[PDB]
Nucleic acid binder design. Structure first.
Ligand SMILES: CC(=O)O[C@@H]1[C@@H](O)[C@H](O[C@H]2[C@H](OC(=O)[C@H]3CC[C@@H]4[C@H](C3)O[C@@]3(C[C@H](OC(=O)/C=C/c5ccccc5)[C@H](C)CO3)[C@]43CO3)O[C@H](C)[C@@H](O)[C@@H]2OC(C)=O)O[C@H](C)[C@H]1O
Ligand SMILES: [Mg+2]
Ligand SMILES: [Mg+2]
Ligand SMILES: [Mg+2]
Ligand SMILES: [Mg+2]
Ligand SMILES: [Mg+2]
Ligand SMILES: [Mg+2]
Ligand SMILES: [Mg+2]
Ligand SMILES: [Mg+2]
Ligand SMILES: [Mg+2]
Ligand SMILES: [Mg+2]
Ligand SMILES: [Mg+2]
Ligand SMILES: [Mg+2]
Ligand SMILES: [Mg+2]
Ligand SMILES: [Mg+2]
Ligand SMILES: [Mg+2]
Ligand SMILES: [Mg+2]
Ligand SMILES: [Mg+2]
Ligand SMILES: [Mg+2]
Ligand SMILES: [Mg+2]
Ligand SMILES: [Mg+2]
Ligand SMILES: [Mg+2]
Ligand SMILES: [Mg+2]
Ligand SMILES: [Mg+2]
Ligand SMILES: [Mg+2]
Ligand SMILES: [Mg+2]
Ligand SMILES: [Mg+2]
Ligand SMILES: [Mg+2]
Ligand SMILES: [Mg+2]
Ligand SMILES: [Mg+2]
Ligand SMILES: [Mg+2]
Ligand SMILES: [Mg+2]
Ligand SMILES: [Mg+2]
Ligand SMILES: [Mg+2]
Ligand SMILES: [Mg+2]
Ligand SMILES: [Mg+2]
Ligand SMILES: [Mg+2]
Ligand SMILES: [Mg+2]
Ligand SMILES: [Mg+2]
Ligand SMILES: [Mg+2]
Ligand SMILES: [Mg+2]
Ligand SMILES: [Mg+2]
Ligand SMILES: [Mg+2]
Ligand SMILES: [Mg+2]
Ligand SMILES: [Mg+2]
Ligand SMILES: [Mg+2]
Ligand SMILES: [Mg+2]
Ligand SMILES: [Mg+2]
Ligand SMILES: [Mg+2]
Ligand SMILES: [Mg+2]
Ligand SMILES: [Mg+2]
Ligand SMILES: [Mg+2]
Ligand SMILES: [Mg+2]
Ligand SMILES: [Mg+2]
Ligand SMILES: [Mg+2]
Ligand SMILES: [Mg+2]
Ligand SMILES: [Mg+2]
Ligand SMILES: [Mg+2]
Ligand SMILES: [Mg+2]
Ligand SMILES: [Mg+2]
Ligand SMILES: [Mg+2]
Ligand SMILES: [Mg+2]
Ligand SMILES: [Mg+2]
Ligand SMILES: [Mg+2]
Ligand SMILES: [Mg+2]
Ligand SMILES: [Mg+2]
Ligand SMILES: [Mg+2]
Ligand SMILES: [Mg+2]
Ligand SMILES: [Mg+2]
Ligand SMILES: [Mg+2]
Ligand SMILES: [Mg+2]
Ligand SMILES: [Mg+2]
Ligand SMILES: [Mg+2]
Ligand SMILES: [Mg+2]
Ligand SMILES: [Mg+2]
Ligand SMILES: [Mg+2]
Ligand SMILES: [Mg+2]
Ligand SMILES: [Mg+2]
Ligand SMILES: [Mg+2]
Ligand SMILES: [Mg+2]
Ligand SMILES: [Mg+2]
Ligand SMILES: [Mg+2]
Lengths: 67, 217
RNA sequence: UGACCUCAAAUCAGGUAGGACUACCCGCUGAACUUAAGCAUAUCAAUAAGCGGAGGAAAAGAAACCAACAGGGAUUGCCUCA
RNA sequence: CCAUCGACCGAUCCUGAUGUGUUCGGAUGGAUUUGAGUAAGAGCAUAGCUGUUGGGACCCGAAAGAUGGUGAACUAUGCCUG
RNA sequence: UGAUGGUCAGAAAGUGAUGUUGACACAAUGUGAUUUCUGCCCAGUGCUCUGAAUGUCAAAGUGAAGAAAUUCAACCAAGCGC
RNA sequence: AAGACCCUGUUGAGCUUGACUCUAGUUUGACAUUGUGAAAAGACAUGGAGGGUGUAGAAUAAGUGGGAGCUUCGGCGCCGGUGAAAUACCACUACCUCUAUAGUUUUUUUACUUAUUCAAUGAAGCGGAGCUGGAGGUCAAACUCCACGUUCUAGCAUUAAGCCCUCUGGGCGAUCCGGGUUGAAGACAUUGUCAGGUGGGGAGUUUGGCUGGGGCGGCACAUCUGUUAAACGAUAACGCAGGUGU
RNA sequence: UACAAACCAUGAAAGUGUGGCCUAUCGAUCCUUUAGUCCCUCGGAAUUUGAGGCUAGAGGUGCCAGAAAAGUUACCACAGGG
């Protein structure tokens, strides 16, 4: 009735420099408004990504990292 | 309560007489154009109004005139009377958008005689007349020079589609107080024409071709 | 080292209030029996009882009055209005 | 003074002249309507008996209601001290 | 009922009881030693719990019309309803 | 002993309950007590300045009352031709917009403390800053943080020793500054006045009649037909057979 | 029920019709509301709202000449009554 996806803004996820492939992927959140900033409701999110992706090698396929 | 302040308009026509005798100007007398504000009304929604009485003294000190026709016309404004006409285009024209449009934009007033009942909504009609023309009720056994000199005093005050209408008349030749209340003897229509009458006023301005406004209503 | 303002103390100097009476007087507060042939609004009554405050009188009083007249002219009381 | 038929005044309804702030005026003539009326005044005042109403109301009589006060020397319960 | 409290008091108070108290406590009820047990019913009347949307819904407030008094309408707390 | 049972009285009282009418209390709202900031959706008002048609005028009107180079100049020029309405225009008004000043303005959030509210203390050490160490790892130069005299023992701790300047006194010892006693709470509570709800806890009152006692029943309580009714009319009973509120 | 003054219906007309073929089928003061007259008043003088009057209906009292009304007393009271 409203399509809540028109008010979503996409953000880029950056991993720390200890890993190699720091471009983890993309996430989204409700667009920043007057009452609520998008930033504060966005901090604290946890992403679980496989270590083989963060290092390129498939030898780390069995470990998964929470960022 | 009626926002009439004649003593206010006294010192104001003097301040008008300032930039028309004191202060600065060309040298002398011009067109008095004191204004109002006009609120508490509605250009649409309601209806229309009109009010014309021939104001106390002489407004237009150089009125422009174009006496239509010849029949019973001209023959009453020859010699001592100027203007008149020589028909001519009353049989031609009537196809030329101009000439009559020129006559309307040139001179300031025509007449109505007793034969003009044809020309105004026949030879003109949608062509002119209703576009903003007012035939002058003049015939034979009438006041003549008196009622057509009173045409200079024949003001208007009709309604259109704007909350402006702050027009004025007269000239600065008037004595210290010849205006003042003479303009107030024009506010009477403007009052009765509006809905709540004396209430539908937003502001008031004393001014001419020479002034701005000197703190009025 | 002295003014001012505000606030205190004294067995300071000198004063003043309280309490009483009940018939009348100025206020507050305030019932019910009763009448209504029942009864609640109403009446008894702006009364009894309760409280504060006076005097020889008290109170009121020299119009933010009455009027609607051809106008009267502080207050109070009697007769009348009724 | 009695019965009866009328007249007059007010209200109600009907008619509606000359006239006119053209909506006022209301002449004239009527109506099983109506008034505690007019129609050559009868009242005012004092007193008395009888009768009426409000009053304690012929005298005495409740169970009740209200206001303001006095009691825990008996007795109920708590506390203190024996 | 965890004290900005429960239960209770006062006409009010810068007023009180529990309270020198704090859930092994205070306050309110029912039943009534021990033994053995206390079944089914929340539809009714109570008591209690949420209120995100929500019928009803006061004063004030809001909007409109009016010359205004005023009228009409929307919104509408708790409660009821659910 | 003026029946206490029974009945009557338009006599009560004690008690009860969604009987009638109210009420202390309490709850909910509004107004006042009530002040200072920030943000949000937005509305306004006020000061600016700026903005515009479909043709035609090549020329962007969006308004309606008028002449003349005003401003050295003369870019553009000032009614005459092109439009329904005119090319420096002005004297000013009138509308509207879409930019800006930091004006009041409604609703939601969270900051303040001085009103108000709670508490303690013989109003004792509050707030801020600085000395001293312990750390951060110093990467300029000391920014941040922590601590800043008492813990085997049922003792003792009271009216300054010591030092500096000479001034029977002044200072340090016992760091400076602000004189906010110190916390909590806070424009909400509370309190005042109305308004809606709740309110046998309490207040006041009522709770027909007839009647083979009263009660239950019935209505003979307002009524109609035929009869009892005894040949005018009238005539009673909780007499007889029935009816009416349509 | 019978007429008086209107306006109608019906019938050729005479006539008849003022509810039901007759004997039952209903409702005061106060308040409200509607209709009528478009009349009187708001009392210092006016206009327009509002209000109040005069006349006729409706809303109802069935205990029907017309209060607004639940129980209990074996804790009980009083005035009386054969
Ligand atoms: C509904 C309720 O339970 O109570 C109402 C009450 O609300 C009503 O109170 C009215 C009240 O009634 C009265 O004061 C009396 C008027 C006349 C008496 C009586 C009451 O009404 C009577 C009885 C009966 O008329 C009624 O009954 C009237 C109901 C009514 C309703 C609204 C307005 C006016 C009357 C007769 C025809 C003549 O009139 C009368 C002779 O007994 O008057 C006020 C002005 C009215 O606003 C008020 O109305 C309201 C809603 O409150 O009185 C009625 C009798 C009750 O039924
Ligand atoms: Mg002394
Ligand atoms: Mg002295
Ligand atoms: Mg005394
Ligand atoms: Mg008595
Ligand atoms: Mg009585
Ligand atoms: Mg009696
Ligand atoms: Mg009684
Ligand atoms: Mg009295
Ligand atoms: Mg009284
Ligand atoms: Mg009293
Ligand atoms: Mg007394
Ligand atoms: Mg006294
Ligand atoms: Mg004395
Ligand atoms: Mg004397
Ligand atoms: Mg005196
Ligand atoms: Mg005086
Ligand atoms: Mg006098
Ligand atoms: Mg006197
Ligand atoms: Mg008399
Ligand atoms: Mg009469
Ligand atoms: Mg006439
Ligand atoms: Mg006459
Ligand atoms: Mg008579
Ligand atoms: Mg006589
Ligand atoms: Mg006589
Ligand atoms: Mg006696
Ligand atoms: Mg007597
Ligand atoms: Mg007597
Ligand atoms: Mg007695
Ligand atoms: Mg007694
Ligand atoms: Mg009593
Ligand atoms: Mg007492
Ligand atoms: Mg004792
Ligand atoms: Mg406790
Ligand atoms: Mg139990
Ligand atoms: Mg069981
Ligand atoms: Mg089963
Ligand atoms: Mg159940
Ligand atoms: Mg239940
Ligand atoms: Mg909702
Ligand atoms: Mg409301
Ligand atoms: Mg309003
Ligand atoms: Mg009114
Ligand atoms: Mg609600
Ligand atoms: Mg509920
Ligand atoms: Mg006896
Ligand atoms: Mg006895
Ligand atoms: Mg009796
Ligand atoms: Mg009683
Ligand atoms: Mg009783
Ligand atoms: Mg008793
Ligand atoms: Mg209480
Ligand atoms: Mg409150
Ligand atoms: Mg507030
Ligand atoms: Mg410190
Ligand atoms: Mg302290
Ligand atoms: Mg705080
Ligand atoms: Mg508050
Ligand atoms: Mg309050
Ligand atoms: Mg209090
Ligand atoms: Mg209340
Ligand atoms: Mg109760
Ligand atoms: Mg009771
Ligand atoms: Mg009864
Ligand atoms: Mg009986
Ligand atoms: Mg019976
Ligand atoms: Mg007989
Ligand atoms: Mg029978
Ligand atoms: Mg029937
Ligand atoms: Mg007839
Ligand atoms: Mg009736
Ligand atoms: Mg009646
Ligand atoms: Mg008056
Ligand atoms: Mg009058
Ligand atoms: Mg009359
Ligand atoms: Mg009766
Ligand atoms: Mg009877
Ligand atoms: Mg018993
Ligand atoms: Mg018994
Ligand atoms: Mg017992
Ligand atoms: Mg006997």
């Amino acid at each position: 009735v409203v399509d809540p996806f028109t008010r979503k803004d996409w953000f880029d996820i950056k991993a720390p420099t200890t890993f190699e492939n720091r471009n983890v992927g993309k996430t989204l959140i409700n667009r920043s408004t007057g009452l609520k900033n998008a930033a504060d409701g966005l901090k604290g999110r946890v992403f679980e990504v496989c270590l083989a992706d963060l290092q390129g090698s498939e030898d780390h396929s069995y470990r998964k990292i929470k960022l | 309560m009626s926002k009439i302040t004649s003593s206010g308009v006294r010192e104001n026509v003097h301040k008008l007489l300032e930039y028309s005798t004191e202060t600065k100007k060309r040298n002398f007398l011009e067109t008095v154009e004191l204004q109002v504000g006009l609120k508490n009304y509605d250009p649409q929604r309601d209806k229309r109004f009109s009010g014309t009485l021939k104001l106390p003294q002489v407004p237009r000190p150089n009125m422009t005139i174009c006496i239509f026709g010849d029949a019973f016309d001209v023959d009453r404004a020859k010699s001592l009377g100027v203007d008149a006409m020589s028909v001519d285009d009353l049989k031609k024209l009537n196809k030329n958008k101009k000439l009559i449009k020129k006559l309307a934009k040139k001179y300031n007033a025509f007449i109505a005689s007793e034969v003009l009942i044809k020309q105004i909504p026949r030879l003109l009609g949608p062509t002119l007349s209703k576009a903003g023309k007012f035939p002058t009720p003049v015939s034979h056994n009438d006041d003549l020079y008196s009622k057509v000199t009173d045409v200079k005093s024949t003001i208007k005050f009709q309604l259109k589609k704007v909350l402006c209408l702050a027009v004025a008349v007269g000239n600065v030749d008037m004595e210290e107080d010849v205006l003042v209340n003479q303009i107030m003897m024009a506010a009477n229509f403007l009052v009765s024409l509006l809905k709540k009458n004396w209430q539908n006023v937003g502001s008031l301005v004393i001014k001419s071709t020479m002034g701005p406004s000197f703190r009025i209503y």
